[PDB]
C-alpha cells in the first residue's frame with residue numbers, strides 16, 4: 077500500500093547561481109539571470125539573450141577526460157544530481173544500491189553536440205563524427221552516467237515531455253517510491269538548448285521575446301507588454317526518499333511530496349487552450365491525489381512562461397479550480413528571473429516551491445509593471461512576500477498539451 | 489492491491505512490413521528486412537545497410553500538410569499507434585477520454601529533421617529553419633499528436649531510455665493502469681536514425697556490423713562471426729487495458745502483461761557486464777513482479793543485438809536466472825531479421841512475444857550458423873519452432889546500463 081515520499085536533498089545549476097542557496101538568494105532578491113548570450117554569434121538571430129549558466133566548472137564534478145565526451149545538458153544534469161545526493165547525506169552501499177534509482181530528463185537533450193557533429197559531417201565527412209556522439213548526446217545518459225559513478229542499481233530511466241519534463245520526472249519518481257519499486261530516487265531534469273538550432277528553431281516559431289535592448293525586462297509573466305518566453309539553461313535534481321527510510325537514517329526532510337497530477341489538453345501541438353481546461357484538470361487530479369481541500373493551497377509556482385496565451389490560460393485555470401480562494405493564495409513565476417529552462421523548468425521550480433515552504437516566503441514575479449486584462453490575483457509583483465505556506469503547488473505545461481502538477485507541504 | 493492489464497490492440501512499422509500481420513509473417517519465415525540504404529550517399533561510411541521501412545504512406549494516417557510538420561520517427565509512431573487503437577476497437581467518449589493516455593517514446597528522436605535543418609542553418613542562416621522544427625522533432629510529439637487527434641486526456645508522456653525505450657514505455661504504461669491512474673494506455677516506441685548522423689554516430693563508435701557485401705547475414709546474434717548491430721527503423725504500439733474494462737466492452741484480448749522489471753547495471757556507458765548481472769536482476773525483478781517461478785518461462789525474446797559482449801552477457805544472465813530450466817525454454821533474437829530498431833526494439837519485440845503466445849511458436853534466430861563459446865541454449869537457430877508457450881519474456885538492455893523486462897502470459 078502507498079508509501080509517503082519526502083525531499084532529503086536538492087541540487088541546481090541556474091542562470092542565478094551554481095547551486096541551490098546562491099540561486100535562491102537571487103530569487104528572493106528579485107535578481108535577473110538574463111543577459112546577452114556570449115558563447116556564440118547571434119547577430120543573424122531575432123533573439124540574442126537568454127539565461128546562461130555563468131562560470132560552470134565541470135572539474136568540480138568530473139575528470140576533464142569524462143567531461144569532454146558529454147553535452148553540456150548532461151554535465152549540467154550530473155552537477156545538480158551530485159549536489160542533491162551530497163545534500164541528502166545518503167550513503168550508497170551493497171545493502172541499498174538496488175533500491176536507489178534515477179530519473180533525470182530533458183526536453184531537447186544534446187542539441188549543441190548534435191549541431192557540432194552535423195557541421196563536421198557536412199563540411200568534413202562521417203569519419204570526423206565523435207565516437208562519443210551517441211552516448212554523449214542522448215537524453216537517458218544523465219541517469220546512465222549518474223548510476224555508473226554512484227553505483228545506483230534501482231529503476232534507471234529518463235522522461236522527455238518538453239517543458240513539462242522536470243515535473244513529470246519528479247512525480248513519476250515519487251510514484252516509484254510510493255508503490256515500492258525504489259526507496260530512493262534522484263529525479264529532475266537538465267537543459268542546454270542555447271545553440272543555433274535552439275534559438276533559431278524557437279525563433280522560427282516566433283515563441284521568444286525579442287527584447288534584445290532590455291534582456292532583464294524580457295520575461296514579464298502576466299504583464300500587458302510580454303512578447304514570448306526567454307530561453308534559459310540549467311538543471312534541478314531532488315533526492316526523493318520513502319518517509320520511514322528517511323526517518324530510520326535521521327535524514328533532514330525539506331518537505332513532503334503529497335500530490336502529482338498529469339493531464340493532456342488534447343487541444344493543439346504548441347498552444348494551450350485559452351480557458352486553461354487541461355491545466356485545471358491536471359491541478360484537480362494533483363489535489364485529489366494529495367487528499368486536499370483546494371483552500372489549503374497557499375502558494376503556486378506557476379509555469380508563467382511570459383507568452384500571451386500561456387499566462388492568461390493559467391489565470392483562467394487557477395480561478396476555475398480555486399474559485400474565491402484564488403484571491404487568497406499567492407502565485408508567482410520565477411521564470412520572471414530565471415527565464416524558461418524548458419525540460420529543467422519543473423525541476424528548479426519544484427526546488428523553489430520546497431524552499432518557499434522552508435522559508436515561508438512567496439518568490440516575486442519581477443517585471444510585472446502592468447498586469448494584463450484579468451491578471452488580478454496576488455501574483456507577488458516585484459518583491460518577495462513572507463507569508464504562511466503549508467501547501468505549495470508547482471505547475472508545468474508543454475508542447476503536445478502535456479500538463480504536470482506537483483503538490484508539496486511542510487513536514488513535521 | 490493491483491489491477492490486471494491485458495493487450496487488446498497492436499500496431500507496427502518494421503523492416504519486414506507496414507503492419508503486424510505482414511511483419512509477423514516475415515518473422516515466422518526467417519525473412520531479413522536488411523538491405524543497402526537507398527536515396528542517401530553512404531560512400532564515405534563504413535556501414536551502408538540497415539532495416540528501412542519500405543513503401544510507408546503517411547497520408548493513410550495524416551494529410552500531406554500535417555505530415556510535413558513531423559519527423560519520420562513521429563510519423564512512424566503515429567502509424568503504429570493509429571493501427572493499435574483501430575485494432576483494439578476501443579470507442580473514445582466524453583465518459584472515458586480522461587482514462588485513456590499515451591506513452592510513446594524514442595531513443596534518439598528527430599535526427600533526420602535536425603540534419604535537414606542544420607543544412608538550412610549553415611547554408612542560409614537561422615531564418616530558413618522551419619517554424620515546426622521544435623514541435624516536429626521532440627520525442628513527446630507522438631504522445632502529443634495522438635492525444636490531440638483522438639481526444640485522449642489521460643496520462644500523456646514519453647520515455648527516452650535509448651535501446652530500452654519501448655520496453656520501459658509499455659511497462660510504465662501497464663503500471664499507470666495497474667495503479668488506477670488510467671484504464672487504457674497506448675504505449676511503445678518509434679525510431680528513424682538512418683541519417684548520416686545515426687549511421688555516422690554509431691559508425692564512429694565502431695558499434696555497427698560493416699558486412700556491406702552481405703547485409704542479410706550481418707545481424708547474427710550469438711554467431712561467432714558477429715561484428716556489431718544493424719541499425720533499423722520503425723515503430724510498435726500496444727493498447728494496454730484494465731481486464732474488467734476489456735471484458736465489459738467485449739474486447740479481443742491477445743495476452744496478459746503480468747510482469748515488468750527494471751534495473752541499472754551501474755557498469756559502463758555503452759557495454760554490459762560480461763556476466764549480465766544487471767539483466768539477471770531485471771529478469772528476477774520482472775518474475776517477482778509477476779509472482780512467477782523461473783521454471784514457468786517458456787519463451788524469451790532476447791535483446792540479442794549481435795554485439796560480441798551484449799549477446800554473451802544475455803546467455804550468462806539467462807543461465808544465472810533459470811539454472812536447470814535455461815535449456816528447456818527457447819530464446820530467440822528477432823533482431824537477426826529486423827535489425828535493432830533502438831527505442832522501438834522493445835515495442836516491436838513485445839508484439840512478437842504476444843504473437844509467440846497467440847500462435848504457440850518461437851520465432852527463429854536466423855544467421856546462427858556457428859554458435860559462439862557457451863552459446864549452447866535453445867536459440868531457435870534458422871527456423872521457427874512450434875512449441876508450448878504459456879509465459880514469454882521480452883528483454884531490452886540499453887546504453888547507460890538501463891534494463892527492462894516484460895512478462896506476458898496466455899489469457900483465458
Ligand SMILES: COC(=O)CNC(=O)c1cc(C)on1
Nearest residue numbers: 360363364370396397398399
Ligand atoms: C469549476 O470549478 C472548479 O473546477 C473548482 N472545483 C473543483 O472541483 C476542484 C476539484 C479539486 C480537487 O479542487 N477544486
